[PDB]
A paper describes a structure:
In these mechanisms, the effectiveness of inactivation depends upon Fc gamma receptors (FcγRs) expressed at the surface of effector cells and the interaction of the extracellular domain of the FcγR with the Fc portion of the antibody bound to its cognate epitope. In contrast to humans, macaques only have one low affinity FcγRIII receptor, CD16, which shares a polymorphism at position 158 with human FcγRIIIa with Ile158 and Val158 variants. Similar to human low affinity FcγR receptors, the macaque FcγRIII receptor consists of two immunoglobulin-like domains packed against one another at a roughly 80-90 degree angle in a comma- or apostrophe-like shape. The Mm FcγRIII forms an asymmetric complex with macaque IgG1 Fc with the Fc binding near the bend in the comma-shaped receptor; the majority of the receptor’s contact residues to the Fc reside on the C-terminal second immunoglobulin-like (d2) domain closer to the cell membrane.
The second complex was formed using the Val158 variant expressed in a GnT1- cell line without deglycosylation which leaves the Man5 N-glycans that consist of seven carbohydrate residues from the GnT1- expression at glycosylation sites. The model was refined to an R/Rfree of 0.182/0.218. Both the Mm FcγRIII Ile158 and Val158 receptor variants in complex with Mm IgG1 Fc crystallized in monoclinic space group C2 with similar cell dimensions. Structural studies revealed differences between the interfaces of the FcγRIII-Fc complex formed by Ile158 and Val158. The latter has a higher interface BSA with added contributions from receptor residues Val158, Leu117, His119, and Gly159 [i.e. to Fc residues Leu235, Gly236 and Gly237]. The contribution to the interface from glycan-glycan or glycan-protein interactions between the Fc and the receptor is also greater in the Val158 complex, 204 Å2 as compared to 164 Å2 for the Ile158 complex. Leu117 makes van der Waals contact with Leu235 of chain A of the Fc in the Mm FcγRIII(Val158)-Fc(IgG1) complex. Overall, the Mm FcγRIII(Val158)-Fc(IgG1) complex is formed with a BSA of 1,832 Å2 which is 10 and 17% lower than BSA of the human FcγRIIIa(Val158)-Fc(IgG1) (BSA of 2,041 Å2) and FcγRIIIb(Val158)-Fc(IgG1) (BSA of 2,207 Å2) complexes, respectively. The Mm FcγRIII(Val158)-Fc(IgG1) complex diffracted slightly better and had a stronger complex interface as measured by the total interface buried surface area. Importantly, we also observed glycan-glycan and glycan-protein interactions at the receptor-Fc interface of the Val158 complex that were absent in the Ile158 complex interface.
Residue numbers in the entry:
A (entry chain A): 235 to 443
B (entry chain B): 232 to 443
C (entry chain C): 4 to 171
Amino acid sequence: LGGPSVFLFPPKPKDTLMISRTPEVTCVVVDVSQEDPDVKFNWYVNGAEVHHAQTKPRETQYNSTYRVVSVLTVTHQDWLNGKEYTCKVSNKALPAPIQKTISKDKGQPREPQVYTLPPSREELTKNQVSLTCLVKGFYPSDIVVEWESSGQPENTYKTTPPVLDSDGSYFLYSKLTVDKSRWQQGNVFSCSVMHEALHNHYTQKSLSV
Amino acid sequence: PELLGGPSVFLFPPKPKDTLMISRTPEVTCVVVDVSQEDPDVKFNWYVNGAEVHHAQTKPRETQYNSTYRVVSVLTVTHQDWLNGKEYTCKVSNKALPAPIQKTISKDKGQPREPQVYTLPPSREELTKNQVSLTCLVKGFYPSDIVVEWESSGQPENTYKTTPPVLDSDGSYFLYSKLTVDKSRWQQGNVFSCSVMHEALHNHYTQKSLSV
Amino acid sequence: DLPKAVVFLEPQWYRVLEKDSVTLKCQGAYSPEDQSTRWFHNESLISSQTSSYFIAAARVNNSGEYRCQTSLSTLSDPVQLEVHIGWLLLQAPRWVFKEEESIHLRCHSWKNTLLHKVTYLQNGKGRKYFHQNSDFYIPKATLKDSGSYFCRGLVGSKNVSSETVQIT
Ligand SMILES: *[C@@H]1O[C@H](CO[C@@H]2O[C@@H](C)[C@@H](O)[C@@H](O)[C@@H]2O)[C@@H](O[C@@H]2O[C@H](CO)[C@@H](O[C@@H]3O[C@H](CO[C@H]4O[C@H](CO)[C@@H](O)[C@H](O)[C@@H]4O[C@@H]4O[C@H](CO)[C@@H](O)[C@H](O)[C@H]4NC(C)=O)[C@@H](O)[C@H](O[C@H]4O[C@H](CO)[C@@H](O)[C@H](O)[C@@H]4O[C@@H]4O[C@H](CO)[C@@H](O)[C@H](O)[C@H]4NC(C)=O)[C@@H]3O)[C@H](O)[C@H]2NC(C)=O)[C@H](O)[C@H]1NC(C)=O
Ligand SMILES: *[C@@H]1O[C@H](CO[C@@H]2O[C@@H](C)[C@@H](O)[C@@H](O)[C@@H]2O)[C@@H](O[C@@H]2O[C@H](CO)[C@@H](O[C@@H]3O[C@H](CO[C@H]4O[C@H](CO)[C@@H](O)[C@H](O)[C@@H]4O[C@@H]4O[C@H](CO)[C@@H](O)[C@H](O)[C@H]4NC(C)=O)[C@@H](O)[C@H](O[C@H]4O[C@H](CO)[C@@H](O)[C@H](O)[C@@H]4O[C@@H]4O[C@H](CO)[C@@H](O)[C@H](O)[C@H]4NC(C)=O)[C@@H]3O)[C@H](O)[C@H]2NC(C)=O)[C@H](O)[C@H]1NC(C)=O
Ligand SMILES: *[C@@H]1O[C@H](CO)[C@@H](O[C@@H]2O[C@H](CO)[C@@H](O[C@@H]3O[C@H](CO)[C@@H](O)[C@H](O[C@H]4O[C@H](CO)[C@@H](O)[C@H](O)[C@@H]4O)[C@@H]3O)[C@H](O)[C@H]2NC(C)=O)[C@H](O)[C@H]1NC(C)=O
Ligand SMILES: *[C@@H]1O[C@H](CO)[C@@H](O)[C@H](O)[C@H]1NC(C)=O
Ligand SMILES: *[C@@H]1O[C@H](CO)[C@@H](O)[C@H](O)[C@H]1NC(C)=O
């Protein structure tokens, strides 16, 4: 049969990595009726009901159905150590509470070495050149590849989704477009990645010519 | 076991290597799943804008795991009938469905430009290792379904693993391929090639090989 | 002239499904001494003979326009019958609704199949969601309806929608 449905989502990596953005794990109840609502979240963190569970209102959805979201503020360390977080919801529509649990990719890590390729000499024929940031064999999928210029960000880049290599490690190529005028003047462009297997969770190489 | 509720149908296109290259048999496939204890039968009807069912030859029902006899049937295509842009429909019908469900796939539309193909060499700092990574950047094409292969003169290494096409900032796709070979072959002095197959490519082939 | 007979829809939905069952009734006379109803399909004559037409499996060659008339009761008036085929079906009593009345919408299934997570929409946006299958009684006309009203469900795992119906 059917009823309300729960979706447990992990923190977005840039939050958990880099101590400056609190990391939250959002629990989303969906298809929650208007008659028969009142959803009760029973949060669990490695065996502790943890009553800092901050929930939210009843969201208004085209399909009349309601949608409730509750964010639990997490710790940067407790996520990475491997504590298992867990949502348990009940509603008079559910004849047995629906519980689902998550806890970060539990598997043996690896380091991402960050190599940085340059434009091909023919591309310098085009109107804008493409700078490549290679990120070889790492673990796990979560990662934060980003480009920067001189001082602050560059947002003219598109990054390949993580691929699975022959050994079981994840590589990914980011790429960023730039004015041939801007690349030939000699501005230095730095590629910064953030993974849970890099001391201080932050390596960053640089490219020029 | 089962639980039932009304069968389903999935239609997949032909593999690009079979479309962009001749004397390859390219195909359209009708995967029908979730038939059950009712023993729902075959009945497959393929169309191009109304058509004949000669390229058909349904297979045998196979259940494997979950006790729902998978049924599949595959339709052969001319490499030229694709690409220009036909349609191809299924209309499969089961004695446990209201009205025969049907799906069509056709080709992707849209202006196809030719894929550029740049070739990138091992990173400066990547030479401090027994294994380097040759990189091939295929940027600027449209119809995603592209083929990328590597080779050394006349041998095909499965060393490479390639990124799936990723949408760029102008509707064109770009991808990356990585080939990890022992440095020796690199510095030693070999020539490695990145062949690219795209309907927007002269003879559907271009390779921008590289060496030190 | 004499009293008109009337056709009664059992149930009250003039939209059916290629496997749903309808039964038609006729009151007008009750043919005092001896009953007989004479039934009319698309302007013709069925040999039903009883006071009730029995349509177990509805199937297109069963739609059209219907009429009846017992041992008196003149001749019945024209009642329409549609027979769509599909999964969902937004059944209704009638569709002409002005001023202000009360509507009793139904999101029918097919071969009495269950329908999880049912929704009713107002020419796009929904208005009343239900977890299990039930009708959508709306009382006291909204004064702003009159857009395409359809419903969507879940027949096991299949994502099924309904063919639209315009009300006013
Ligand atoms: C009524 O309407 C509401 C909402 O309206 C609509 O909402 C969306 C869908 C749009 O269409 C809007 O235009 C519109 O307003 C409906 O609510 C929706 O219900 C569906 C399911 O019924 C949900 O789908 C699920 O989505 C999750 C992921 O959802 C993220 O990504 C969505 C698209 O990118 C996005 O819309 C979501 O909001 C959410 O976005 C993320 O949010 C977090 C939290 O803030 C944020 O940090 C993220 O950054 C953000 N994402 C991004 C990219 O930024 C999806 O994962 C679910 O898939 C699981 O389940 C599937 C079903 O089996 C399965 O196929 C998948 O593989 C996956 O399965 C699980 O995967 C893992 C790995 O194995 C594991 O846990 C399980 O083993 C596995 N299997 C199962 C069974 O769990 C799923 O598809 C929508 O999210 C939800 N919309 C919401 C919540 O906003 C509602 O259904 C409507 N009802 C009716 C009756 O009409
Ligand atoms: C009972 O029996 C089997 C059990 O097999 C099971 O297989 C997997 C799933 C595991 O769970 C195993 O443990 C288990 O044994 C089930 O049969 C399968 O059922 C699933 C879902 O019901 C189907 O999944 C669909 O798969 C397509 C893609 O399918 C290709 O790739 C799969 C891997 O990605 C592969 O498994 C398939 O075999 C198939 O592979 C292709 O095979 C052909 C020939 O065999 C070959 O020529 C191709 O080259 C090859 N392709 C590749 C890449 O290798 C996937 O696309 C479907 O997604 C649709 O549905 C989603 C949710 O509805 C939706 O989000 C998607 O967008 C998509 O929906 C469509 O989307 C587009 C637009 O967005 C559009 O077409 C439509 O609008 C929309 N809807 C539809 C209907 O098309 C989907 O995930 C399997 O194909 C199927 N058969 C298999 C695996 O052989 C069965 O489900 C079991 N019962 C239950 C209850 O689970
Ligand atoms: C009383 O009148 C009603 C109408 O007022 C009438 O209902 C009609 O019956 C016919 C009989 O089939 C239906 O015709 C179908 O029309 C659809 C369009 O929706 C077509 O797609 C169909 O074509 C198929 O049928 C042929 C035979 O299977 C195939 O050879 C052909 O290739 C197609 O596959 C089909 O012709 C019609 O939809 C209904 N409804 C109407 C017209 O509103 C009813 O039959 C009359 N009473 C009696 C006793 O017949
Ligand atoms: C029943 O349907 C078929 C479909 O065209 C038709 O040949 C036949 O005449 C129909 N029966 C009647 C009574 O109309
Ligand atoms: C499937 O049904 C849902 C309603 O639950 C609807 O929002 C969605 O549009 C349907 N599928 C697709 C592919 O749109």
